[PDB]
Amino acid sequence: EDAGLVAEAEAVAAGWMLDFLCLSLCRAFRDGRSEDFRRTRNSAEAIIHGLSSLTACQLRTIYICQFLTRIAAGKTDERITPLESALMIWGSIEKEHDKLHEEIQNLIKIQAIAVCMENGNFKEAEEVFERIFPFKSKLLMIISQKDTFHSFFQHFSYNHMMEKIKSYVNYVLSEKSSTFLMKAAAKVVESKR
Amino acid sequence: EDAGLVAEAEAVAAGWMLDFLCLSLCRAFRDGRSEDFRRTRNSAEAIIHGLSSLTACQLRTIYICQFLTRIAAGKTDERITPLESALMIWGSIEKEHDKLHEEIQNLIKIQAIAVCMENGNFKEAEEVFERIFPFKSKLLMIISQKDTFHSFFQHFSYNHMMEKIKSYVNYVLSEKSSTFLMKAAAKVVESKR
Ligand SMILES: OCc1ccccc1N1CCOCC1
Numbered sequence: 001e002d003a004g005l006v007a008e009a010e011a012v013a014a015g016w017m018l019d020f021l022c023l024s025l026c027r028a029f030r031d032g033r034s035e036d037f038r039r040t041r042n043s044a045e046a047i048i049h050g051l052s053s054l055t056a057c058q059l060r061t062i063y064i065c066q067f068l069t070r071i072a073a074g075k076t077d078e079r080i081t082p083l084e085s086a087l088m089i090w091g092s093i094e095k096e097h098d099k100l101h102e103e104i105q106n107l108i109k110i111q112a113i114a115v116c117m118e119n120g121n122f123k124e125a126e127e128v129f130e131r132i133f134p135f136k137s138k139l140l141m142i143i144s145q146k147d148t149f150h151s152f153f154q155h156f157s158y159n160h161m162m163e164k165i166k167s168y169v170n171y172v173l174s175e176k177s178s179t180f181l182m183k184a185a186a187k188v189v190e191s192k193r
Numbered sequence: 194e195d196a197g198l199v200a201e202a203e204a205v206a207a208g209w210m211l212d213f214l215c216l217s218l219c220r221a222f223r224d225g226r227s228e229d230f231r232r233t234r235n236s237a238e239a240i241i242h243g244l245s246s247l248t249a250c251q252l253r254t255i256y257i258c259q260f261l262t263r264i265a266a267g268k269t270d271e272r273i274t275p276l277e278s279a280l281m282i283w284g285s286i287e288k289e290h291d292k293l294h295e296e297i298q299n300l301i302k303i304q305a306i307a308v309c310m311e312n313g314n315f316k317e318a319e320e321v322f323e324r325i326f327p328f329k330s331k332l333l334m335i336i337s338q339k340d341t342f343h344s345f346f347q348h349f350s351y352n353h354m355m356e357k358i359k360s361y362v363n364y365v366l367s368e369k370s371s372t373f374l375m376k377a378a379a380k381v382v383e384s385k386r
């Protein structure tokens with residue numbers, strides 16, 4: 001056997017497993033299946049170590065997986081919070097900066113502050129505000145007055161952030177719905193049955 | 194979409210990934226590729242969480258993976274050493290107890306003591322001997338006298354244990370060489386080249 005050809009076959013399979021795990025992570029995030037998301041995330045993290053060179057499409061895929069991971073950890077080394085880390089990933093992905101990208105970005109910026117207020121850490125909410133940012137002065141008075149349920153926070157809510165991110169996840173889910181591993185697995189299931 | 198049929202497709206794919214990772218772990222163990230073995234082991238461990246019901250063949254597969262993991266950690270919660278744990282797995286696998294099974298078993302029993310002596314922990318070597326076991330009295334005097342290079346230890350050596358386990362790994366490697374994921378990955382590589 002040729003070790004080089006064996007290593008090449010292992011790299012192709014890693015690529016297939018990555019797309020499968022991304023598609024599975026997207027569904028668990030859309031469905032609210034938290035433990036399934038955690039298991040799929042751990043699997044994707046492990047599989048991604050079998051790839052040392054990634055194509056442009058594979059890089060976009062791992063960054064979507066990292067993004068959804070921080071968003072899922074939003075309310076639960078970097079010296080920043082998970083939502084501030086999701087914001088850094090979001091602004092760096094090789095993707096179009098359309099209306100949806102912009103509204104997801106702004107919802108994360110406000111939710112990175114609001115999740116700290118929800119947890120009762122108002123000093124942390126101020127530190128998050130200083131790192132991200134008359135609008136700023138109003139937002140700073142809201143945090144200072146512990147006005148968690150201010151109408152602004154209700155419009156740029158957590159549920160609205162999740163709905164917008166889930167709409168983006170549906171496009172990713174559609175784009176990868178037909179990848180090799182899932183398509184072959186569906187055929188085996190449909191043949192039984 | 195049917196969530197049940199999606200979950201079934203995900204279980205089929207997990208089964209395929211398990212066989213692929215087992216075959217990859219077997220090759221890394223045979224080749225002495227330590228970091229590749231560590232990466233594949235972490236991937237197999239993660240993938241195995243996506244299966245809650247395992248067939249008789251899948252159980253045998255995960256136990257071979259656990260066995261090779263302890264053997265690989267032999268010289269590096271349970272209150273026993275990795276080689277004593279490999280011995281517990283080995284004696285429990287749904288497999289034939291032939292001449293090869295017996296010689297692998299005895300080589301592990303002696304190496305579980307000898308690796309402690311190699312590391313300079315003779316008190317631990319005595320604790321391992323007491324847990325596993327005129328032959329016993331001779332083996333106990335060897336440990337007590339720190340006779341690490343005694344002719345008995347040279348016949349039931351680490352290298353001999355590794356060669357015997359590698360011969361067993363070659364049968365597993367042959368049995369799984371044709372599994373779905375590796376066979377499809379090889380076709381893509383051969384078509385390029
Ligand atoms: O990067 C691999 C990856 C795959 C899937 C899900 C999450 C991750 N990461 C792990 C650490 O980096 C940030 C999220």
Ligand SMILES: OCc1ccccc1N1CCOCC1
Pocket residue numbers: 234235237238241255258259260262
């Ligand atoms: O059990 C899953 C598994 C798969 C592959 C390699 C090792 C393991 N384990 C992890 C813990 O149990 C003992 C080795």
